[PDB]
Amino acid sequence: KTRSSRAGLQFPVGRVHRLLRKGNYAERVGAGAPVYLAAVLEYLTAEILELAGNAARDNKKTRIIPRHLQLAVRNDEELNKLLGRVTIAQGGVLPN
Amino acid sequence: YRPGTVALREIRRYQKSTELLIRKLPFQRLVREIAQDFKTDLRFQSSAVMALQEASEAYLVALFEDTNLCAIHAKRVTIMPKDIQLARRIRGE
Amino acid sequence: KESYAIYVYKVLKQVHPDTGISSKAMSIMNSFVNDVFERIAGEASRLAHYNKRSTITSREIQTAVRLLLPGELAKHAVSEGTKAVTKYTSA
């Protein structure tokens, strides 16, 4: 029913389309833009959640915490580049 | 323990750790002192002080990590003020 | 007072249903997604303004992804976006 299901996506196509219309990014937006943006956001989130999953798994921890997020995102040089300026609250350094 | 190993031990420890190193109240008193210069009528959310200490500690740790590279490039191992001045001048601040 | 938490749980359960996540880590994710959204929308706006166009469509986000993302991330993200919009328009 919801456009996300029509696209086969989990992310809220409605909310993102609303935000795009609200944010004065342009006077007009095409119907493809919000679904495409939801797609790429869901992909990137899936990637980082995967890596954090592994960062918890080998620490034997059943539950993701920020330390795992930092351990993930700083190991992947591409995601580290994408987040090159980002600071993660309570994210310690990588051991070296 | 063998001589000097304490440094290596505590390096490995504090790299493993994640918690804040600075005392909370001293930091709060500091940021209040700095702020009251700009306006006496002031309040803080505690979370704002947390964010401030988090950002400042991250920035300091990054600057240390760079200046360590400066020191080792000079083939010292003791960090020296001129290292800090250089690293800041390279980064731009 | 919208936030992404439930969607994060959906993707989490898809990738790794075995494991929970801290509310702190959720707040990190909610920051990250908003940041990257603002960034990509800003770039798409800059593109549309540059072309003197009135509107944002798929082609603008498609180019902005190729600008903002690392090459391999772009290569996969643009594919996922193409698949998504293909399904949506076919449906």
Binding site: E47, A55, N59, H68 | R2 | Q14, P17
Partner: peptide, 24 residues
């Protein structure tokens, strides 16, 4: 499990447990 990355990232260790018996 439902989603899998294509990206051929290397294997990674994230374990940060360590000892001090090298120092003793």
């Amino acid at each position: 499990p439902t989603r899998f990355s294509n990206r051929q990232n290397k294997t990674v260790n994230y374990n940060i447990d360590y000892s001090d018996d090298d120092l003793l």
